[PDB]
Amino acid sequence: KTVVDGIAHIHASFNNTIVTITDRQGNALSWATSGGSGFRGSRKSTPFAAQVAAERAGQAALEYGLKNLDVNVKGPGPGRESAVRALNACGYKIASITDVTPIPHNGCRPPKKRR
Amino acid sequence: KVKEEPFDVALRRFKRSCEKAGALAEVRSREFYEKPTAERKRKAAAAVKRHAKKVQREQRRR
Amino acid sequence: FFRRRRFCRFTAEGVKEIDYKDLNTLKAYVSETGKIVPSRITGTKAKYQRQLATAIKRARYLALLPYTDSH
Amino acid sequence: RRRVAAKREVLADPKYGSQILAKFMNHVMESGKKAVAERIVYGALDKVKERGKADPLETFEKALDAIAPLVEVKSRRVGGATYQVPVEVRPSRRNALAMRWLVDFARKRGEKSMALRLAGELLDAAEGKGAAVKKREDVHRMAEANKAFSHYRF
RNA sequence: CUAGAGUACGGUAGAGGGUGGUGGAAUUUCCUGUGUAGCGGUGAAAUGCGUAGAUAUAGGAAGGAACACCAGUGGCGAAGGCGACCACCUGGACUGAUACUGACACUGAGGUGCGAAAGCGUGGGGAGCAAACAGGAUUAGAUACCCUGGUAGUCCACGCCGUAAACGAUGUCGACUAGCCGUUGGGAUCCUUGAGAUCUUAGUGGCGCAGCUAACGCGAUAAGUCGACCGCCUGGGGAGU
Ligand SMILES: [Mg+2]
Ligand SMILES: [Mg+2]
Ligand SMILES: [Mg+2]
């Protein structure tokens, strides 16, 4: 199966980082997470582990081609920009980088403050 | 939004354009609800830290 | 003194009742993302800054100006 | 802690004409028994020349650089969480790490005729099947599980 | 008689009220495609959720409440309070010119009103959050902090209750007393190009001389110098019982 000019989605929480390679149609091709690379704890939240899972998604994406990538970065956590430098390391032409961030204008109220 | 030409240039044009827009400190203040009295402490302490900064700099401007 | 002249962008002229129609004016006062600028950056007088914020919120309602880069 | 520490130097080996071997000789001496330890280091030097035709300095030159490591951990605690950080070993330090690992595994070799214990250690590390080489590479494997803590809370 | 007080006339500024209407971002539940092994959480874990196809990701539908940026020692209101946009009714303040009424004023025991939030009654409505509660963890012990869930409530209409660190810990009203730097709104004068200038009222801030104060500290928005009326205090517990 052959598709080109895919879209890379990056979801970065405070505890885990999930990377997914899709098409313009919004269909899953390859997903890879920080916990699947075998860190599982305080090591899980590091921006180093957002490079291990980033390239591993970039290796099952060459099953279908995808010589062009379009990056949407989403999340507050660390490894927010370290994952982009681990994309063209596999040899992918990155066209444009775009922030997507859910910001409520007023929104529902968040949980209470820790003590 | 950052388009592209080496790659290290477009990174620093993106790390900076996100911060110069915002939406990184605002996310960090969505994870605990402040009661409106505690939001009147930011309005109180920051107004003191601005009017005192206009006067402490005048000692440097002597 | 760029923050000084933009105070005179409304006070030197007799353009006191601004409208939500001159988009060539309003695009000078909107950032690249979509959010509205402060008044210590333009340096406009606070009579007009309040009057400037209404003409944004009406022009935003008529789909003449976006909100965010999402839509 | 005002920085004080100057440098003292020992470089003397007249009967062979060497410099690394004299510093290695000091890691074998116990309680100032220098003349005892001198004939054991030469006693394990000639057995290599008995074993291999090459000059046994170069066997010792090769056996250092397969026991000498590259990176190692450093448990710098943040003050509320015990972390470990893989750090680059300074080039001056990395000589003495091999020579100190080499002697301590010679003493648990468990042979007879003590100079034969150190003889077998310098033969293995030109190949890699020594216990010092196995102790070298295992600490190398500890750094990559630690590699997540390289810069971040480090 | 017109200096207090009130009226008539222009003119600005405002999250001041009440009654409807309409938005966009985000959260959740549901539907559908792709796709396949974990997600979530934490000093670290566990309870929990997962191939009976989750998280992710795209499309759609329904519904509820809050209103980023502007936004500020900034405004308005008698105080509590009040931030999306528009219509709809509707109160008061500022500022200028000018005429009129000619002391019509001040305070106020009793009495009358408006009273945050939690709570209470009948009816709606149920997104998130979350006392009570349940489980995991920590712990000599942990009902607690931390974690996963979760009900009354928070929301609306009508009625009730009347207290708060209801705070400027300072009753309302009137008159005099060196200055300087800010800021909201409004007229001035002024050479005019001003990033103008100075003066004057109505607010709202930072320093400061006399003066007062046990001291700290206030200092034309007095705790300074003086008037008019009211409320209240008399060692600590016992007891605002
Ligand atoms: Mg010291
Ligand atoms: Mg109050
Ligand atoms: Mg009181």
Contacts for D81 with CB less than 8 Å, ≥ 6 apart = A42, D153
Instruction: Determine the Cα–Cα distance for residues B36 and B42; give it in Å rounded to an integer.
Output: 10
What letters, b where the CB count within 10 A reaches 16 and e where it falls short, cover A14-39?
A: eebbbbbbbeeeeeebbebbbbebeb
Contacts for C21 with CB less than 8 Å, ≥ 6 apart = none
Instruction: Determine the Cα–Cα distance for residues C65 and C68; give it in Å rounded to an integer.
Output: 10
**How many CA atoms are closer than 13 Å to the CA of D56, on its beta-carbon side?**
20
Instruction: Determine the Cα–Cα distance for residues D127 and B22; give it in Å rounded to an integer.
Output: 58
Give B58 Cα–ligand 3 centroid separation in angstroms: 41
What letters, b where the CB count within 10 A reaches 16 and e where it falls short, cover B45-57?
A: eeeeeeeeeeeee
> Could you tell me the domains of chain D?
19-149 (1.10.455.10)
Query: Which amino acid is located at D148 in the chain?
Result: A
Q: Which long-range contacts (CB under 8 A, 24 or more apart) does B16-22 make?
A: B18/A99, B21/A99, B21/C31, B21/C32, B21/C33, B22/C33, B22/C35
The two structure tokens encoding residue A65: 């081609």
Instruction: Determine the Cα–Cα distance for residues C9 and B37; give it in Å rounded to an integer.
Output: 38
Q: List the beta bridge partners of residue A21.
A: A8, A30
| Dihedral (CA of B16, B17, B21, B27) sign | negative
The two structure tokens encoding residue D106: 């010679």
Q: In degrees to the nearest 10, what's the CA dihedral of D64, D67, D69, D72? A: -140
Which burial class, exposed, middle or buried, applies to A53 when counting CB atoms under 10 A from its CB (0-12, 13-18, 19+)?
buried
Beta strand pairing call for A93-99 and D71-72: unpaired
First to last CA, chain C: 35
Distance of C1' in E120 from CA in B41, Å: 34
Give B42 Cα–ligand 3 centroid separation in angstroms: 27
A1-115 domain in CATH 3.30.420.80?
yes
**Helices H / strands E in chain C, number of each:** 4, 0
Q: Does A68 touch chain C (CB under 8 A)?
A: no
- 8 A C-beta contact, residue C21 and residue C54: no
* Helical pair B53-60 and B36-51, crossing angle rounded to 10 deg: 20
Which burial class, exposed, middle or buried, applies to A41 when counting CB atoms under 10 A from its CB (0-12, 13-18, 19+)?
exposed
| Dihedral (CA of C57, A76, A98, B18) sign | positive
Query: Which amino acid is located at D46 in the chain?
Result: D
Which nucleotide comes closest to A13 if you measure CA to C1'? E40
Domain boundaries, chain B: 1-62
